[PDB]
Amino acid sequence: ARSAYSYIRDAWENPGDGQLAELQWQRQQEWRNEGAVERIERPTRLDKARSQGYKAKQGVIVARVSVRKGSARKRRHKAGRRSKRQGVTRITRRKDIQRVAEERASRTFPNLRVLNSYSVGQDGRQKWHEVILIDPNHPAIQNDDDLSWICADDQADRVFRGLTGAGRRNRGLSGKGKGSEKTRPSLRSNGGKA
Amino acid sequence: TGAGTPSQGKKNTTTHTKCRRCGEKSYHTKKKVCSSCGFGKSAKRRDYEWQSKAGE
Amino acid sequence: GRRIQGQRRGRGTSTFRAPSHRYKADLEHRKVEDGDVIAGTVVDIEHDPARSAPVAAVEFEDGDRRLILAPEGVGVGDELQVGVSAEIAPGNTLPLAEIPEGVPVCNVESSPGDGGKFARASGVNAQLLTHDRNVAVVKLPSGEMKRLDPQCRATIGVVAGGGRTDKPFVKAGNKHHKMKARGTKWPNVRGVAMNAVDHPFGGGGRQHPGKPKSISRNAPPGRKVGDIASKRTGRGG
Amino acid sequence: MQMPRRFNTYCPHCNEHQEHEVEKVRSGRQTGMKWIDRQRERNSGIGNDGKFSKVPGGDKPTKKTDLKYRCGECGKAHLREGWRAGRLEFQE
RNA sequence: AAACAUCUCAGUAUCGGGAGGAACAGAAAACGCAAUGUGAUGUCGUUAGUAACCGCGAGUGAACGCGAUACAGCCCAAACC
RNA sequence: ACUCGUACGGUCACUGAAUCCUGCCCAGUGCAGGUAUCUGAACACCUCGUACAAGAGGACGAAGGACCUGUCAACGGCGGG
RNA sequence: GCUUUACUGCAGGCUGUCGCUGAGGACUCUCACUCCGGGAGGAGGACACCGAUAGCCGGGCA
Ligand SMILES: [Cl-]
Ligand SMILES: [Cl-]
Ligand SMILES: [Cl-]
Ligand SMILES: [Cl-]
Ligand SMILES: [K+]
Ligand SMILES: [Mg+2]
Ligand SMILES: [Mg+2]
Ligand SMILES: [Mg+2]
Ligand SMILES: [Mg+2]
Ligand SMILES: [Mg+2]
Ligand SMILES: [Mg+2]
Ligand SMILES: [Mg+2]
Ligand SMILES: [Mg+2]
Ligand SMILES: [Mg+2]
Ligand SMILES: [Mg+2]
Ligand SMILES: [Mg+2]
Ligand SMILES: [Mg+2]
Ligand SMILES: [Mg+2]
Ligand SMILES: [Mg+2]
Ligand SMILES: [Mg+2]
Ligand SMILES: [Mg+2]
Ligand code: NA
Ligand code: NA
Ligand code: NA
Ligand code: NA
Ligand code: NA
Ligand code: NA
Ligand code: NA
Ligand code: NA
Ligand SMILES: [Sr+2]
Ligand SMILES: [Sr+2]
Ligand SMILES: [Sr+2]
Ligand SMILES: [Sr+2]
Ligand SMILES: [Sr+2]
Ligand SMILES: [Sr+2]
Ligand SMILES: [Sr+2]
Ligand SMILES: [Sr+2]
Ligand SMILES: [Sr+2]
Ligand SMILES: [Sr+2]
Ligand SMILES: [Sr+2]
Ligand SMILES: [Sr+2]
Ligand SMILES: [Sr+2]
Ligand SMILES: [Sr+2]
Ligand SMILES: [Sr+2]
Ligand SMILES: [Sr+2]
C-alpha cells in the first residue's frame, strides 16, 4: 500500500495548492524572521530527507538556509574592457543557489559534512533549502552501514569541492554520454569549457 | 619647500617594525598589520602566485 | 574623467561629515504613556551647535533631564507640559487634535510618535489650519498645505532664534566659522572654473558651460549638475 | 524607359518562341526560420554582436531591371540579366 | 585578425575556497561502426585538424569506435515487516 | 554620508563688496508641463500556420516622440539689405 | 589624457509586464509585505520595496 511518506511527497509536487499552500504562507512569515542558517530538529520534507539518506539518529543534523534571490551581484569593471566583458546586469553565476546554501550551512557546522539538500520554497526575494549534515566523528555514525562512508578523510569538506549531488549536477555530470565531453571527469581537466 | 631633501628631514615617524609572527621588519605599528606575512590581517600566511614567474 | 565633488560627498569621509561628536542632542518629544501627567521646569537655556539656535534644558517630574526644541519666549523657571491634556500655552507639546485651529506650532511630527520632523529651524513655524477626526491640515514654513494624522504631536509657538538670517555674514571668515559646525565642504569652487576632467562644465578657453544647464531628472550621478529638472529658470515671464 | 507588357520571345521551358508577360519581381516575405535567423539569435548577446551590429548599406544611383518573364502557354517564368534603368514603365 | 567591435590571446595570468598521497570520475533514463552489435570510469596511442563553429575572415575544434593500460562491482529510499 | 539636520533647512549651479542698473529674442538646442488625434516594446489576448512548436498578422498601447504651452540671472543669439 | 548630436556598447533613471500576491476599466477589503510606535496599537496595502524582462533617455563610464 501507499506509504505515509508518499503523501508528504505528493503534497510537495504543488507547494502552491491545498493545505501545503496555507502552511507555506504561514511558515515563511517565521522563516523571514529567522537567520541565514537555522538548525532544525526535524526535516520539513521527511520523504525527501529519508530518500536522500536522512536517518533519525545521533550525528544527523538538518538546517534550513535562506539565500537572496536573483542573478549575480557583480561590480562593474573599473579598468578597460571590450564591450563583451562590460556586461554587469544580465550576468549570472555558475553555481546555483542550492549549492551556495549547502556551503553556508557547512561553514556554520565546520565539523559536519554535507550529505545532501533539497528545496523548501521561496518568496519573491529569497529561497530556502534544508541541508542534511553528518557528524563523521560520532560512533553512532562510524558504525552505520549506510553512512559510515562519509567518515573517510577524502570526504572532508566535500561540499566545497563539488562532491554533493547538487554539486555534481551543477557540474554537468548527469549525462554519461553525449554532452558530457567537457564535464567528465572534471571541469578543470577539460580546460574549464563545460 | 622642495619635495626632495628638505622634505626628508621631517621623517621621524615609526611605522614598520619587527613582526612577532614572521620576524621581518614589516609589522606596521599603526595599522597593526604585517605587509610581509599578513599578521594582523589573516590567520593564513600572506602569499601570492605573482611572487614568482608564472611557470615557476 | 574623475568623480565630481557631489560624488565624493556620498562616501561619507571626514571632509564631508558633520561634527556629530560635538553635537548636543536630538530634540525629540518625550514619550508619554498617556494622561499628560508629565510636566517639567526649564532649568537652563543653551546654544545648539547643530542649529545655531537656542535650546532649553527641562527637568521633568519623574526625574528626566533632557534638552528640548525651544520656541521663542521660553525662560528659566517656566513650567512646560507634554500630553493630551497639556495646557494650550507656548512651549507646551500635545497632539494636533488638542491644538486649537489658527495656532502656530513647531517641531511637528510626520508620523505620530516619531519625535518631530517639521518646522525646527530658527524662527520658523507651521500653522495649524483645519481640524477633523481623520486629518489635521497644517501649513508648513514653505507654504505647503500638509495633511497630517491629528495624532501627530507638536509644540505651540514659533521656534526661537528668528531673524538670524537678516544679518549678512559680511566676511568669509564668519561663513567659515558656521560652516565648521555643519556637514559641508566649503568654500565653493565653480564648476566652470575646473578642468574638463573634473566637471561637466570644466574646460574651454574662457569660462562658460559648454551646454545648457537644465539637466534631466533621469541624468546619472556625475552628470546631474547645474539646474536639476528645472520647471523654468530666470526671473522673467 | 518604356517596356511592352507582353511580347514574343524564347521560352527556355517550351524550348520555342511564345508570348510572355513581363512583371516586376515582388519581394517575397521572410519566414524568420532560416539558418541566418537562428545565428543572429545564438550569437547576439551582451555588448557588440559582430556582423549583427552592422546596419543596412546604401544605394546605387540607379538599379538594374528586376523582372520575371512568364510564358503565356506553359505558365512558367524565367529570369534574365537586368540592365540599369532609372525608371521602367510598361506599355499596356 | 597586419585597423577593429564578434572572434583571438584564454577559461590563460591572477584572485577566493577545499581535499589527498594522489585527486576527480565511475556501474547507463549509456552507445547508435543501426546491430542477431558494444557493455562502469580514468588515462595513453589513434580516430583528426576529421564532424562542428566562425566579420563562413583570422582562427577555434570534439565524439562514437578501435589498439592499449588496469579491471570490480555494489549500497540505500519505498513496497512487506 | 548629508543627519543629534527639517525650508530662517541643505542640496545643485551661475555671478562676484557697495552704488546706479540689468533691454529685445522661446525659431534651434536643453529642462518642464500638457496632450483630442498620430506614433510607440514585451507579457497576456485573437486570426492564420504547425496533430504541437518555430513563424506571419491583428487588437490593446506605458514612458518617450510627433503636436501645444511655459522658461534666457537656460545653452546661446541681437545680422545683411 | 580630453571632447562630442563619431562608431559600438555599459552603468544609471523613467516606464510597461511577470513573480512576490491575498479576499470581495472603475472599486472595496485585509491576511502577506512596508512604515510609525517602548508597547498596545496606528498608517499604508496587494501597492510599494525586491527578483526578471521589455521600450525610452543615457560621454556618467568603457
Ligand atoms: Cl562538507
Ligand atoms: Cl549658511
Ligand atoms: Cl525593374
Ligand atoms: Cl559499439
Ligand atoms: K580584445
Ligand atoms: Mg540493509
Ligand atoms: Mg532632535
Ligand atoms: Mg569642516
Ligand atoms: Mg565660488
Ligand atoms: Mg584652470
Ligand atoms: Mg566631463
Ligand atoms: Mg562667464
Ligand atoms: Mg567670470
Ligand atoms: Mg590587431
Ligand atoms: Mg583527471
Ligand atoms: Mg579582416
Ligand atoms: Mg577554444
Ligand atoms: Mg558519440
Ligand atoms: Mg573672478
Ligand atoms: Mg525602522
Ligand atoms: Mg571615451
Ligand atoms: Na562543515
Ligand atoms: Na552560440
Ligand atoms: Na596588427
Ligand atoms: Na590600433
Ligand atoms: Na566569430
Ligand atoms: Na571495427
Ligand atoms: Na528658443
Ligand atoms: Na596623454
Ligand atoms: Sr577543513
Ligand atoms: Sr605653497
Ligand atoms: Sr630648505
Ligand atoms: Sr615628523
Ligand atoms: Sr584585521
Ligand atoms: Sr596565497
Ligand atoms: Sr530624529
Ligand atoms: Sr527616535
Ligand atoms: Sr567649459
Ligand atoms: Sr526678463
Ligand atoms: Sr549564445
Ligand atoms: Sr548586443
Ligand atoms: Sr549612393
Ligand atoms: Sr571491465
Ligand atoms: Sr555689484
Ligand atoms: Sr525652447
CSV table of C-alpha atoms (C1' of nucleotides) and ligand atoms in Angstrom, one decimal, chain D residues 39 43, chain E residues 6-7 53-55 57-59, ligand 26:
chain,number,residue,atom,x,y,z
D,39,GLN,CA,22.6,32.5,-35.9
D,43,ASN,CA,25.3,34.9,-31.5
E,6,U,C1',32.0,39.2,-32.8
E,7,C,C1',36.1,36.2,-32.8
E,53,C,C1',31.9,26.5,-35.1
E,54,C,C1',33.4,31.3,-37.4
E,55,G,C1',33.1,39.7,-39.7
E,57,G,C1',37.7,36.2,-42.0
E,58,A,C1',41.7,35.3,-38.9
E,59,G,C1',41.3,31.5,-36.2
H,26,NA,NA,33.2,34.7,-35.0
